[PDB]
Amino acid sequence: EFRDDACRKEIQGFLDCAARAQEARKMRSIQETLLPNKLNKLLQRFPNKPYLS
Amino acid sequence: TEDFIKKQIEEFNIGKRHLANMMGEDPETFTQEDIDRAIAYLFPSGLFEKRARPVMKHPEQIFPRQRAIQWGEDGRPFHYLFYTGKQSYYSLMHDVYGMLLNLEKHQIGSRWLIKEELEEMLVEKLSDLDYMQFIRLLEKLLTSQCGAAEEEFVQRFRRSVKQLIEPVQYDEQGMAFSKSEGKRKTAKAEAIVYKHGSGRIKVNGIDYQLYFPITQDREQLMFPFHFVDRLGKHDVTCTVSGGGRSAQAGAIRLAMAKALCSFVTEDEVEWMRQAGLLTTDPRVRERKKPGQEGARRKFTWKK
Amino acid sequence: SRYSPEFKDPLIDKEYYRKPVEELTEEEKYVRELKKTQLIKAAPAGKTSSVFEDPVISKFTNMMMIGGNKVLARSLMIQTLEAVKRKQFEKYHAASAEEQATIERNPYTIFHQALKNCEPMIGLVPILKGGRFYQVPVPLPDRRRRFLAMKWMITECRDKKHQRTLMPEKLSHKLLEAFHNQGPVIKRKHDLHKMAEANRALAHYRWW
Amino acid sequence: KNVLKIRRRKMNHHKYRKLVKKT
RNA sequence: CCCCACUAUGCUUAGCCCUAAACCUCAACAGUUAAUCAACAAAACUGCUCGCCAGAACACUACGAGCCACAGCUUAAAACUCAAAGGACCUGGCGGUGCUUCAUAUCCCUCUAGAGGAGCCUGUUCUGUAAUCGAUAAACCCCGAUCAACCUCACCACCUCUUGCUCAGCCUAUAUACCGCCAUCUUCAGCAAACCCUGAUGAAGGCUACAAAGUAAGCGCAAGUACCCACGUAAAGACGUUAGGUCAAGGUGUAGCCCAUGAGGUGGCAAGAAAUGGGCUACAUUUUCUACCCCAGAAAAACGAUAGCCCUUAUGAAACUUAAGGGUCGAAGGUGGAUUUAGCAGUAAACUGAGAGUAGAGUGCUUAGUUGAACAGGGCCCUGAAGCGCGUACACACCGCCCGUCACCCUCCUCAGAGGAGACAAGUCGUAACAUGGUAAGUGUACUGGAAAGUGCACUUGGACGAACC
Ligand SMILES: [K+]
Ligand SMILES: [Mg+2]
Ligand SMILES: [Mg+2]
Ligand SMILES: [Mg+2]
Ligand SMILES: [Mg+2]
Ligand SMILES: [Mg+2]
Ligand SMILES: [Mg+2]
Ligand SMILES: [Mg+2]
Ligand SMILES: [Mg+2]
Ligand SMILES: [Mg+2]
Ligand SMILES: [Mg+2]
Ligand SMILES: [Mg+2]
Ligand SMILES: [Mg+2]
Ligand SMILES: [Mg+2]
Ligand SMILES: [Mg+2]
Ligand SMILES: [Mg+2]
Ligand SMILES: [Mg+2]
Ligand SMILES: [Mg+2]
Ligand SMILES: [Mg+2]
Ligand SMILES: [Mg+2]
Ligand SMILES: [Mg+2]
Ligand SMILES: [Mg+2]
Ligand SMILES: [Mg+2]
Ligand SMILES: [Mg+2]
Ligand SMILES: [Mg+2]
Ligand SMILES: [Mg+2]
């Protein structure tokens, strides 16, 4: 009957899991910040030549 | 041109002597500050922008830095990097790179100048990325155990970068006190805090609990003394005017904290500053703008 | 914001400022040294180092405020606390010594516990997948949970059902009900949880 | 290339088929 | 279009039919890579041969002819009509366009307060009157007006004057001739003369920082300045967009009136069937009255009008109609639907003054001040913004273009009268095509349907699938 009194362990697990999900989002974002930008810079350094120079 | 600058210099000297005569001052000891004061008196102009007011300065300060001709009559440019178009900047880069090579073979008090400072040094126009590259090179030079022979060069691009305790006075009866002032919104308060006291506070001649019947305001008055744990130790006399009850309480709080700084230790003063007791709240009412209800409230849009 | 970005919010804790220098880790000493050379905002007029200062009650009073009448809001809050304490004292005295062990008389504790009980664990947020929004159940941050508890309490008090009943009495009665895990606020929290469970089938519509 | 010519031919053919069916 | 059922049909046999975007839209054979080559595409050519082509549409058509074909296929014209049709690109807009990243009171959720519900004030639209004018999506709607009893006044009715206050006059038309001052994106940051280069010297384009053709004076931003800081608010905000507003601030070109469209005088309209916009008042208990300006006492079905009626007073020559005060009455209403406004801090909200203009007149406007909050964390359906791309039959630029039926008139052709084509040309019903054209488009063929067209089978890209892994 949704009485939180008799579901404390499950509620606490749910809350801690949500907190860990937030932490995972933050750590994943910072870590993500090879990158397409770096890869494009390297390709620019060594670009394709479909013509004659 | 250089001849024009020389003529301007001669005219400036003649005018300096004439102005010394006009002001009756001695031409020999007649300085630039005196020139400025005399010109301000003679040609009073209230234009807000100081650069718009009359100026009689030396031609060096008046005219900008004119980059000299970089090639002789033979047509051959003087500097070996002239054709790069940024000869000064590239010479600097080349020298720094040479220093880095030499170092590689052999082995809060300042800041890096701004791009404008570098441009003025080189009398040349640069780019954001040029400045960034130069700063990265200088950073590498610094980190690479730059010796005195290198730090001498490095410093050419380095630019240099606590509550004021009021004096303690003594009343006619010899008891020590400190006086301070503080403004909040439209309320100004002057507070006198005695070295030894029983915590009594008299505001405008009225005891604090009667002047500030609001528990919030009395808490504000308590906060300074309570923080440094001196409740009941100092007596206080405050004269406050302007603003409402809350603004007056805040102003008295600021004045009391500033005065109490003198009677607390330096660590206590720094702690109060970090707690915000000593910082003047800059938040003041924003002026209403025409065509909108309030400072930010706009008239209800009619799509 | 009249405060430039350089300005930092003041910290108000006599214990923190009196902490021994030896107890400070390298990073903590560095933080103190940095703050020695930082700009700090002026202490807001809402908080002080008063040992009796309660941030939760301060925020509740702010939420209860109407049109910048801090005086009236604070008066209502103190009246509510006094009413709660008086009711608890009456019950304590009228109660037997055995149950007096359980009867609690600290109004601050009663208020904190009532709010914590009312805090809704899982909320319903609109989530859009494929162009259609649905009320997906979702975990809530602690800030949102506390705010929802306070807002439900205040709105329940402000409802017009209790006519000619002063806000101190209304709020004290509702707070006691919540503390004993009863009343319209707890009913509303359970209703939110029930709706979330009913819409449990849409949980996967969330992506974060 | 656009298909304007194909569309014109298609419309003409559709009209012709409809006319033949009609008559 | 989506879902279900089922048939011809797809299958086997024997005949017919002989059409496809039957396209690799690139003929067969032999040869060359040298001095290139409109554009794009799949580089440019040489020799030889066959077939084919000669403006568009009429036209995968009519006739003639042939055929196992009978609503068919192959070959295939002409008359009337037009100055174009067309192929490839560049720029711009547009996309119910792709990916990525954002919006910081901002597009959605989230916080606060509101509007949308009642009365009133007021603007507008409508109705009415003899009775102005202008704005009238954003960017109008307490707007021109920091203001209408007479005046203001440009309106209507009547009367009056004619070298007229003016070396006349005209608030007469033209903001789609203008100056003047402005909204608008703009809550932007780009605009750029003068040069240089790239494209075969086409319209056009000009970036990579471990840098690859850009340099740029000037303008804007920025900087500087007012306010209380270096923060914030102001101010500022270029080139242009909407032929955006104003010929009624004034002037001003063109046109128009001159015994009147000019001038003067008296009076008079400026109301509400009703809708709608903004604001004020409330719906109360965090309330109402009293004292005080925050330690009170009462009220509490009463709360609630600044509405109505009566009286007085202020200004004025004129007051039922303007304002203030008082008396009288205590009305609708009980926190309001989808929808929608503002706000990121001394802000929202509440409260208190002052000023502009008037003789007097606003709940309006400008502005000083007091108290003084909550959320500020997630996302991309929609709005939008940027970047990089894709498509493009649009170029008056999607409020675009354009198809077909039906009826609207002439030319020509076939025809026993009726059909067909074209042109002219405004309509009616849809939105089939051009953007992923909102179901990708189309070829052949079959059935179906006002109508474009829909669907079935195969075929084409003259569509895409975002082009390392995810
Ligand atoms: K309302
Ligand atoms: Mg046709
Ligand atoms: Mg094939
Ligand atoms: Mg055919
Ligand atoms: Mg035929
Ligand atoms: Mg025939
Ligand atoms: Mg908004
Ligand atoms: Mg209404
Ligand atoms: Mg008008
Ligand atoms: Mg109009
Ligand atoms: Mg008159
Ligand atoms: Mg009048
Ligand atoms: Mg006239
Ligand atoms: Mg115009
Ligand atoms: Mg600026
Ligand atoms: Mg501005
Ligand atoms: Mg216009
Ligand atoms: Mg107009
Ligand atoms: Mg006239
Ligand atoms: Mg009345
Ligand atoms: Mg009178
Ligand atoms: Mg009454
Ligand atoms: Mg379509
Ligand atoms: Mg389609
Ligand atoms: Mg098809
Ligand atoms: Mg069908």
Sort C188 into a burial class: Cβ within 10 Å, 0-12 / 13-18 / 19+: middle
| Method used to obtain the model | cryo-EM
Query: The tokens of C168 are what?
Result: 């101190």
Is B187 (CB) below 7 Å from strand E?
A: yes
Q: Record the resolution, in angstroms.
A: 3.3
Amino acid in the structure at residue A28: R
Cα(C124) to ligand 7 centroid in Å equals: 23
Give the closest-approach CA distance of B191 to chain C in angstroms. Answer: 18
Beta carbons of B234 and B194 less than 8 angstroms apart: yes
Q: Which H or E run contains B178?
A: strand B176-184
A15, two tokens: 């809350």
Nucleotide nearest to C157 (CA to C1'): E286
**Measured CA B300 to C1' E174 distance, in angstroms:** 37
Q: How big is chain C, counted in residues?
A: 208
Decide: C78 and C64 in contact? Cβ < 8 Å: no
Q: Using the C1' atom of nucleotide E403, identify the protein residue whose alpha carbon is closest.
A: D11
The DSSP-derived string for chain C is --S-TT-B-----HHHHHS-GGG--HHHHHHHHHHHTS-BPPPPTT----TT--HHHHHHHHHH--SS-HHHHHHHHHHHHHHHHHHHHHHHHHS-HHHHTT----HHHHHHHHHHHH--SEEEEEEEETTEEEEEEEE--HHHHHHHHHHHHHHHHHSSSSTT--HHHHHHHHHHHHHTT-SHHHHHHHHHHHHHHHGGGGGGG---
Contact criterion met (CB below 8 Å) for B57 and B66: no
Partner-chain contact B223 C43, CB within 8 Å: yes
Are C121 and A15 in contact (CB < 8 Å)? yes
C2, C17, C18, best to mutate vs chain B, most B CBs in 10 Å: C17
| Residue of A15, A25, A28 to mutate, interface with C, max C Cβ within 10 Å | A15
Rounded to a whole number of angstroms, the distance from the CA of C16 to the nearest CA of chain B is 10
What residues are neighbours of ligand 2 (ion), with CB under 5 Å? Answer: D 12
d(C-alpha B279, C-alpha B224), whole Å: 12
Residue in the block written with tokens 């993500």: A32
Q: Which residue has the tokens 């419309």?
A: D11
Q: Which nucleotides of E are covered by protein (CB under 7 A)?
A: 21, 25, 57-62, 71-72, 86-88, 108-114, 137-141, 208-212, 216, 224-235, 277-279, 284-287, 293-295, 300-301, 334-335, 340-350, 365-382, 392-393, 403-405, 419-421, 433-434, 441-445, 449, 451-453, 462, 468-469
Give contacts of A11 with chain C, Cβ < 8 Å: 121
**Nearest alpha carbon to residue C62 among C151, C179, C2, C148:** C151
Three-class SS state of B182: strand
Chain A interface mutation, best of C117, C118, C121, highest count of A Cβ atoms under 10 Å:
C121
Task: Out of B250, B277, B279, name the one closest to residue C45 (CB).
Answer: B250
Which of A4, A5, A18 has its CB closest to that of C139?
A18
Residue of chain A with shortest Cα separation from C139: A18
**CA pair distance B103, C14, nearest whole angstrom:** 52
